[PDB]
Amino acid sequence: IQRYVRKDGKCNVHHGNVRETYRYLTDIFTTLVDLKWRFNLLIF
Amino acid sequence: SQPKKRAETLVFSTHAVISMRDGKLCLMFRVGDLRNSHIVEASIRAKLIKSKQTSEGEFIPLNQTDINVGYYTGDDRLFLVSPLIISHEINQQSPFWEISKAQLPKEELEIVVILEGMVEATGMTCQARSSYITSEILWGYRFTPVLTLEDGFYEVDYNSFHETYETSTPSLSAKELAELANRAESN
Amino acid sequence: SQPKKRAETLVFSTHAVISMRDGKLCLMFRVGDLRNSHIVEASIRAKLIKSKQTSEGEFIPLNQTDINVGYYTGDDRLFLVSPLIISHEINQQSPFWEISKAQLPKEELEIVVILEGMVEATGMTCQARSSYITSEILWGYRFTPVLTLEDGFYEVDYNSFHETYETSTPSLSAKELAELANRAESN
Amino acid sequence: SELDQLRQEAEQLKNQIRDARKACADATLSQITNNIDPVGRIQMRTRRTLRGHLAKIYAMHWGTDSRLLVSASQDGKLIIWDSYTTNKVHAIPLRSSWVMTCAYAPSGNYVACGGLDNICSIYNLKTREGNVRVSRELAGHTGYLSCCRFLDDNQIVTSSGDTTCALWDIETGQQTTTFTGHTGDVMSLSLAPDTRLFVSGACDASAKLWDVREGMCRQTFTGHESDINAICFFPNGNAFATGSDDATCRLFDLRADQELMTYSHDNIICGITSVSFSKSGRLLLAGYDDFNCNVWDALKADRAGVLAGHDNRVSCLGVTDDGMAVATGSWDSFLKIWN
Amino acid sequence: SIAQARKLVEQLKMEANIDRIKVSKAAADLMAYCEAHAKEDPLLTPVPASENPFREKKFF
Ligand SMILES: [K+]
Ligand code: NA
Ligand code: NA
């Protein structure tokens, strides 16, 4: 059965049809630190 | 690194709506978070802003009265992943107790909505705000669903986030609904 | 330095259990902290997640109703050194008021459990989460002890942290237990 | 006196109909079919699982193109699926969650639904500016909309808990014809393939045949000891199957004006929620309350197999027009495609 | 009662005065239709994967 929240704490939700994607660039710092490590280290 | 920036990926619904929910008349607005990361110790509070005059004469410019949105049950503390519809039950203690569909537009009021929690990565507290003026409060309306199920994940459709539709809803003030109920139970 | 990482050394018990405690039927889960350092301003809140339908017609996808776990006494504020069993007393106000052992598995619900406090070294607030779906809620069970005394120190045995055992426990809903009590006191 | 003549007259009139049927009753469908080779092992498998609905599904309907289908749920949505890709072509949000039936129009341009709202909403799927908005709200009934089926883009029939069915003109929103007759809530209806007549199962434990053009009840079929929730025409249009709370499916012939067969088995005590014939009419597929869809040899009267994949009630069935697949809808919020 | 009785009587009269067919013919007719279109029914015959659309294997 599908759960909303996994036992480890992660949440089974995806945010689709975000029309205003620029907002991710508006608060760039949050997007950066929210990235996977490979991508921080790459950008770095 | 300042947290106010997070507010950019926190959305408030464009309108507040009033409709019936399990026999209670409710004022509802919807809130959302565009990121996969979280707002920690999330909480929602709401203030009604309208001027007033005391019996004695004192005019009070933009008088703030807290609107109840879960304070006594701790349901004002949000777990906000997929969008939530925040509900203010319009009861005896409500500032909308004596407001009918008729009177609403002729009232000169504004609801300030405040979302405060911590950006997950920086421990820092963010405050997202928005307002609903009297004309943005749709009487007799419901929010359109956004959630659908996909393989292994719940998918949100932000196209529909702000969208509302009309339902059958009394034109009476919450107070007048009670008066009908008093005679109904006494019958 | 981000605090979510601490969640890795915060454990939730694998199951929630329901059993009788001093005459009250209780839903219990256990929480623990693997580190010697602390979670400051620790607090536990819990949300019941299940869909619903209003009298009027509105379907509400994954409706969150706060579960009481100490809010009115401040016993939801934890001092968490050795493992704690968080207890939700299933009373009149509980969402499990009308749920019997029989009905439980046929209910379509999920309990979200949230532990929020500050990592002792960075002032930053952490949020550890977990879930209990209907099948992980063991009716008629008790958590196995973990604490033992040693010279000068209390030792915890995390091998036993998740372990439960069965006890004699009514199959009736909390509500039906009250109905037996009403006739018992009136007798 | 006066009331006796009429009561007695009603009773004698039944006997003629009673005997006339018995006069035709020179053999049993089972005896005739005793020659045929049995159907063999019918074991199908789930080729798709349609995931999306957030609560119980009440009815679904295949499109004539045998690929697209509609479903209706108390989650408040009409989902139009692509059975091949699983991709949702349309998710249509409703004004009310109490939906009981949906229907896909033959042309694939429209789709209809209604329920405890007492309205048949018709939804345009190809609106001027690429959107899905109600085009008509058919109002008239004084009870829940239990079923509906399109004749063509301008016509649709409906059945209701107000013991009537109705013919509507979509273009004008008016009710063309009222088919009164039933003494109980009408749960299901079925359109003859040539759309010249239709049958309707009701809570008076009877099916009725109705002439679409004449607007009259031709024949009434009895036999069921409880309510009828599903009714379905045999592919040739001269016979139909019914499913009932009394745990039986029954085949009736129109020309013979009587029951030919009963499909039942011990271990089956729960009601039938849906019935459907395979392309050649050899298989009767019945959806049950015990989570199963049972597959019957329509001619021989025995079970060919059973489809067990759902965790809650199977509420609706459907076989594609091209006979390639079967759809099952369930209270577990999933639909499945079987082959 | 009266107005509903007359409703019934008049309906039954119309159901009485109709042409009927013997079951044997009716029955063998259905049986015929079935044996006729037996070839066009994939649900009797476990579907060969080439012919099946819902099995995306195809010729492979
Ligand atoms: K604080
Ligand atoms: Na989120
Ligand atoms: Na500790």
Side-chain angles (χ1 to χ4, degrees), chain A residues 2-18 20-44, chain B residues 1-105 107 109-187, chain C residues 1-105 107 109-187, chain D residues 1-40 42-212 214-339, chain E residues 1-50 52-55:
Chain A
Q2 181 75 354
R3 60 205 305 143
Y4 195 43
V5 175
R6 292 163 155 163
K7 296 221 76 84
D8 71 44
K10 295 207 183 193
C11 299
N12 295 322
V13 176
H14 289 329
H15 306 277
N17 301 265
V18 176
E20 286 169 307
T21 54
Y22 70 83
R23 306 212 200 181
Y24 297 119
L25 309 205
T26 314
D27 69 324
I28 197 78
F29 195 75
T30 310
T31 48
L32 261 155
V33 295
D34 279 18
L35 275 161
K36 321 185 75 163
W37 270 104
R38 67 176 80 179
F39 294 117
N40 275 66
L41 296 169
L42 203 93
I43 289 161
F44 199 98
Chain B
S1 70
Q2 59 185 319
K4 57 178 264 196
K5 291 287 165 190
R6 185 68 161 83
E8 292 286 307
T9 55
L10 294 174
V11 281
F12 291 106
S13 69
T14 191
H15 292 128
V17 300
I18 287 176
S19 57
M20 287 288 289
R21 268 192 160 177
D22 269 317
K24 299 306 217 317
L25 196 77
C26 302
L27 192 147
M28 290 165 286
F29 64 91
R30 172 190 267 171
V31 71
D33 169 39
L34 300 176
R35 287 217 157 77
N36 274 267
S37 75
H38 296 303
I39 303 296
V40 171
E41 286 194 18
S43 98
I44 189 77
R45 66 204 186 91
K47 288 265 193 274
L48 163 60
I49 303 180
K50 83 172 286 175
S51 317
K52 65 160 300 208
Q53 222 151 309
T54 66
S55 316
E56 298 79 15
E58 193 181 17
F59 172 83
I60 303 166
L62 289 170
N63 199 48
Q64 285 169 32
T65 76
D66 199 47
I67 301 167
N68 190 348
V69 292
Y71 192 50
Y72 307 106
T73 64
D75 280 290
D76 60 341
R77 303 172 307 176
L78 301 180
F79 171 60
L80 177 65
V81 179
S82 83
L84 297 176
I85 293 163
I86 312 314
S87 182
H88 159 69
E89 183 182 305
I90 306 177
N91 60 18
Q92 188 173 326
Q93 284 67 46
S94 182
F96 303 89
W97 184 239
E98 295 215 32
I99 295 180
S100 61
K101 186 180 197 185
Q103 287 165 312
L104 179 55
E107 224 71 44
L109 58 68
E110 180 178 346
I111 292 172
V112 168
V113 145
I114 315 179
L115 185 71
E116 291 172 319
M118 292 158 205
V119 180
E120 203 180 359
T122 72
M124 299 176 163
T125 303
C126 165
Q127 175 173 108
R129 293 174 300 273
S130 179
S131 160
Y132 297 106
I133 52 160
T134 183
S135 68
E136 295 159 339
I137 307 183
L138 311 196
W139 188 293
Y141 278 78
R142 270 186 210 164
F143 279 104
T144 317
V146 296
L147 254 182
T148 87
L149 189 42
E150 211 76 32
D151 193 285
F153 274 93
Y154 281 99
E155 192 188 320
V156 182
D157 182 8
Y158 283 87
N159 289 315
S160 309
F161 174 86
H162 299 282
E163 202 185 353
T164 58
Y165 65 89
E166 200 175 40
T167 45
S168 182
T169 306
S171 293
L172 291 69
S173 76
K175 170 182 134 83
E176 291 171 33
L177 262 157
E179 292 175 322
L180 289 177
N182 285 348
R183 279 192 272 94
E185 199 164 57
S186 190
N187 190 39
Chain C
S1 70
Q2 59 185 319
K4 57 178 264 196
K5 291 287 165 190
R6 185 68 161 83
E8 292 286 307
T9 55
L10 294 174
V11 281
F12 291 106
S13 69
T14 191
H15 292 128
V17 300
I18 287 176
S19 57
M20 287 288 289
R21 268 192 160 177
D22 269 317
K24 299 306 217 317
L25 196 77
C26 302
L27 192 147
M28 290 165 286
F29 64 91
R30 172 190 267 171
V31 71
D33 169 39
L34 300 176
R35 287 217 157 77
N36 274 267
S37 75
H38 296 303
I39 303 296
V40 171
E41 286 194 18
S43 98
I44 189 77
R45 66 204 186 91
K47 288 265 193 274
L48 163 60
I49 303 180
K50 83 172 286 175
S51 317
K52 65 160 300 208
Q53 222 151 309
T54 66
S55 316
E56 298 79 15
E58 193 181 17
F59 172 83
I60 303 166
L62 289 170
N63 199 48
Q64 285 169 32
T65 76
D66 199 47
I67 301 167
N68 190 348
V69 292
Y71 192 50
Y72 307 106
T73 64
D75 280 290
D76 60 341
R77 303 172 307 176
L78 301 180
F79 171 60
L80 177 65
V81 179
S82 83
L84 297 176
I85 293 163
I86 312 314
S87 182
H88 159 69
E89 183 182 305
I90 306 177
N91 60 18
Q92 188 173 326
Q93 284 67 46
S94 182
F96 303 89
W97 184 239
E98 295 215 32
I99 295 180
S100 61
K101 186 180 197 185
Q103 287 165 312
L104 179 55
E107 224 71 44
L109 58 68
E110 180 178 346
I111 292 172
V112 168
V113 145
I114 315 179
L115 185 71
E116 291 172 319
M118 292 158 205
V119 180
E120 203 180 359
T122 72
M124 299 176 163
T125 303
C126 165
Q127 175 173 108
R129 293 174 300 273
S130 179
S131 160
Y132 297 106
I133 52 160
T134 183
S135 68
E136 295 159 339
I137 307 183
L138 311 196
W139 188 293
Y141 278 78
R142 270 186 210 164
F143 279 104
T144 317
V146 296
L147 254 182
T148 87
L149 189 42
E150 211 76 32
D151 193 285
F153 274 93
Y154 281 99
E155 192 188 320
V156 182
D157 182 8
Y158 283 87
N159 289 315
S160 309
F161 174 86
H162 299 282
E163 202 185 353
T164 58
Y165 65 89
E166 200 175 40
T167 45
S168 182
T169 306
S171 293
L172 291 69
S173 76
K175 170 182 134 83
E176 291 171 33
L177 262 157
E179 292 175 322
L180 289 177
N182 285 348
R183 279 192 272 94
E185 199 164 57
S186 190
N187 190 39
Chain D
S1 183
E2 194 207 320
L3 188 60
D4 167 19
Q5 269 74 54
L6 304 163
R7 260 136 170 74
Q8 195 157 251
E9 191 170 38
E11 191 56 29
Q12 285 169 304
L13 279 167
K14 306 197 79 167
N15 288 305
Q16 288 182 2
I17 292 166
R18 213 180 297 281
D19 308 323
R21 289 176 180 155
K22 197 66 215 305
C24 300
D26 70 321
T28 61
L29 181 56
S30 56
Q31 277 170 324
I32 299 304
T33 55
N34 252 342
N35 302 136
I36 310 165
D37 284 337
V39 70
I42 298 301
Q43 44 187 26
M44 297 174 197
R45 290 168 225 157
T46 311
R47 296 279 132 68
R48 299 285 179 270
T49 311
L50 304 186
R51 312 189 161 185
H53 279 291
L54 284 192
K56 295 173 181 185
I57 299 173
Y58 290 103
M60 66 80 59
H61 205 229
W62 280 113
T64 50
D65 66 295
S66 297
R67 188 198 177 112
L68 298 176
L69 63 94
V70 174
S71 61
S73 193
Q74 67 190 33
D75 67 358
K77 291 155 213 149
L78 283 180
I79 296 186
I80 297 177
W81 312 77
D82 184 346
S83 72
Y84 293 179
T85 46
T86 310
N87 291 181
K88 299 173 186 57
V89 185
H90 294 100
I92 312 172
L94 302 190
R95 298 173 196 180
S96 162
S97 79
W98 305 117
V99 72
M100 293 193 71
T101 184
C102 64
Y104 219 155
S107 64
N109 303 124
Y110 294 77
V111 66
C113 73
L116 299 192
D117 63 322
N118 288 21
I119 309 286
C120 189
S121 296
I122 309 303
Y123 288 82
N124 200 330
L125 302 170
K126 286 151 175 171
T127 301
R128 176 67 62 74
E129 308 202 328
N131 278 292
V132 190
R133 59 188 293 186
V134 170
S135 37
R136 295 288 184 281
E137 293 222 289
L138 302 180
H141 280 301
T142 63
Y144 56 90
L145 187 82
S146 61
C147 199
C148 67
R149 304 271 92 137
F150 287 93
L151 295 166
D152 66 299
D153 288 354
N154 299 288
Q155 282 193 130
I156 194 172
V157 296
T158 61
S159 56
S160 161
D162 68 3
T163 74
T164 72
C165 304
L167 179 63
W168 304 80
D169 178 15
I170 293 170
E171 166 60 33
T172 178
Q174 292 183 132
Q175 190 169 261
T176 304
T177 305
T178 305
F179 306 86
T180 64
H182 279 302
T183 63
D185 298 23
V186 194
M187 309 308 288
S188 205
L189 52 63
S190 183
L191 226 46
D194 68 337
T195 78
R196 294 206 184 179
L197 42 81
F198 78 89
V199 283
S200 72
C203 283
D204 61 15
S206 79
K208 279 189 187 291
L209 185 70
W210 308 90
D211 196 289
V212 177
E214 306 279 302
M216 298 172 178
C217 170
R218 300 224 145 184
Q219 297 159 253
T220 297
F221 303 82
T222 56
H224 277 305
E225 299 162 61
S226 188
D227 306 341
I228 307 184
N229 316 307
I231 190 167
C232 184
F233 258 112
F234 189 77
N236 79 9
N238 297 138
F240 71 89
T242 54
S244 175
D245 269 327
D246 73 357
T248 61
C249 292
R250 280 167 210 240
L251 182 55
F252 293 93
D253 197 287
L254 293 166
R255 286 137 71 211
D257 186 38
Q258 67 185 81
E259 182 183 330
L260 301 190
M261 191 145 280
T262 295
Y263 313 87
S264 50
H265 181 48
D266 298 0
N267 294 308
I268 298 174
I269 314 155
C270 71
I272 288 70
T273 64
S274 50
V275 302
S276 195
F277 284 101
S278 60
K279 188 70 177 294
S280 77
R282 178 59 181 265
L283 302 172
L284 181 65
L285 310 185
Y288 285 83
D289 293 85
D290 66 25
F291 313 151
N292 294 314
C293 168
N294 276 287
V295 180
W296 304 89
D297 192 317
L299 299 167
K300 280 284 177 79
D302 43 40
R303 297 170 58 202
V306 62
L307 313 187
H310 289 288
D311 300 290
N312 207 329
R313 292 185 192 182
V314 179
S315 61
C316 44
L317 275 182
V319 175
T320 57
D321 253 2
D322 71 346
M324 255 311 309
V326 196
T328 50
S330 171
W331 272 10
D332 67 15
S333 79
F334 294 131
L335 293 134
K336 283 175 185 289
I337 309 303
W338 303 75
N339 252 323
Chain E
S1 301
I2 306 94
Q4 193 177 10
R6 291 201 268 189
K7 270 188 165 198
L8 176 63
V9 164
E10 288 177 17
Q11 170 53 25
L12 291 168
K13 284 174 174 176
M14 295 198 72
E15 297 182 11
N17 297 303
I18 68 181
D19 306 314
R20 290 188 179 76
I21 302 181
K22 272 170 130 51
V23 169
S24 55
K25 283 158 65 179
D29 268 12
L30 301 175
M31 170 174 170
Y33 191 96
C34 291
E35 288 182 307
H37 302 76
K39 60 200 172 179
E40 297 291 322
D41 200 353
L43 301 153
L44 305 160
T45 293
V47 197
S50 301
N52 193 330
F54 290 104
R55 235 172 210 181

